[PDB]
């Protein structure tokens, strides 16, 4: 069964370039990209048997499509990276149809550099349901994981997709609804992890007082 294994996620500063590997097991090799939450955009194709390549005009003379035949590996090289190039990138085998897709490779392109998050509580107020959470703020790059009570409490949790702030750092909220009747008998800790900065934090969350 046909499989295309791409290289891992990349974080690259503007004006720099990136090379994505695509390894085949089991025709044309296309490269497509998708910005998060956006529709897809075709970059180019290459026929491994003659090295014949064609490219989308948008990527004239930034894209380089190659193959190492003896290692069954396609490569996508993109030069002079800019903000607008942050995307998931997929190699695709074309049947001529694009029938087999890789898993994709997130490329992040930002002048920003690694920063751990600040985690601030969202404390409930007062009514029979209680909303509490954690604001995981000003970190770079994605992702952060967020759990509650070490994964004991999973029901009612909404962890939201991060937003990219004007500062160029990310920030997301994770909230959970719980019975009001439990906030005096049961403790709520959000466990926030950011691997790219080796930031692990546990933040207990309780309603606030002085009324």
């Amino acid at each position: 069964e046909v499989q295309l294994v791409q290289s891992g996620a990349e974080v690259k500063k503007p004006g720099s370039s990136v090379k994505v590997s695509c390894k085949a097991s089991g025709s044309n090799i296309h490269w497509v990209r998708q910005a998060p939450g956006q529709s897809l955009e075709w970059i180019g194709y290459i026929y491994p048997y003659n090295g014949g390549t064609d490219y989308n005009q948008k990527f004239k003379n930034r894209a380089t499509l190659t193959v190492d035949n003896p290692t069954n590996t396609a490569y996508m090289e993109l030069s002079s990276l800019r903000s607008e190039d942050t995307a998931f990138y997929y190699c695709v085998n074309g049947n001529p149809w694009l029938a087999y897709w890789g898993q994709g490779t997130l490329v992040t392109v930002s002048s920003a550099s690694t920063k751990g998050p600040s985690v601030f509580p969202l404390a409930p107020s007062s009514g029979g349901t209680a909303a509490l959470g954690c604001l995981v703020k000003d970190y770079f790059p994605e992702p952060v994981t967020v759990s509650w009570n070490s994964g004991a409490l999973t029901s009612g949790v909404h962890t939201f997709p991060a937003v990219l702030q004007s500062s160029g750092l990310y920030s997301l909220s994770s909230v959970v609804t719980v019975p009001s009747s439990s906030l005096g008998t049961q403790t709520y800790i959000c466990n926030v992890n950011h691997k790219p900065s080796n930031t692990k934090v546990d933040k207990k969350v309780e309603p606030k007082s002085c009324d």
Binding site: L40, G133, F160, V175
Partner: protein
């Protein structure tokens, strides 16, 4: 160049419905008796998978309840008995002329009864404020349908350009959405105003719901 547009962008169906998405092209996509159009299915956080090729042919392991018709400039995808596994975003892609372009996508999502949100406002933590920034957070919990507006108001002046939102994927158990919105002020500007308000308009709500707090009475 060649540009495809899908209709509708969003479609709400229940299991067992018959559903039709339309791909319209700016040029004819036929050449040499070949219809040069492909259909994809994408789920959040996965690569696309090909459903249909040459407009009407099923891809490997694609069940027969998926089919496609069309010629020239207009193409359709039909799902005859919606199965739970079919709520997805679907793309059309043209293969005749090279840019190989895609359409914008059509999200197929689960229909259910209207559900008003639960609204909660969160004032900024003391810890954050000493750093110099206030984030006020507004939560809309477990509502349907997806369409919702959050208006920030500070001393009953509605805010523009200082909030960001994100929404969760449709919940697999209860088929509702949730929304988190963040209002970002400087410590300095936050301290000049008394009333921080989150106003939420939604089809489930006879009239907008406001959640607010008064700074320094918290």
């Amino acid at each position: 160049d060649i540009q495809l547009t899908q209709s509708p962008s969003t479609l709400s169906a229940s299991v067992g419905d018959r559903v039709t998405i339309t791909c319209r092209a700016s040029e004819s996509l036929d050449n040499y008796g070949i219809r040069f159009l492909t259909w994809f299915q994408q789920k959040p956080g996965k690569a696309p998978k090909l459903l249909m090729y040459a407009a009407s042919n099923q891809g490997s392991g694609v069940p027969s309840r998926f089919s496609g018709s069309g010629s020239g400039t207009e193409f359709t995808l039909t799902i005859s008995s919606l199965q739970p596994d079919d709520f997805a975003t679907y793309y059309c892609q043209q293969t005749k002329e090279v840019p190989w372009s895609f359409g914008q996508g059509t999200k197929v999502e689960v229909k259910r009864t209207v559900a008003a949100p639960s609204v909660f406002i969160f004032p900024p933590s003391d810890e954050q404020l000493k750093s110099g920034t206030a984030s006020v957070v507004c939560l809309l919990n477990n509502f349907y349908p997806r369409e919702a507006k959050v208006q920030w108001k500070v001393d009953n002046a509605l805010q523009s350009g200082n909030s960001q939102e994100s929404v969760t994927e449709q919940d697999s158990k209860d088929s509702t959405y949730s929304l988190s919105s963040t209002l970002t002020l400087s410590k300095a500007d936050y301290e000049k105003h008394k009333v921080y308000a989150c106003e939420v308009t939604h089809q489930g709500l006879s009239s907008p719901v406001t959640k607010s707090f008064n700074r320094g009475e918290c």
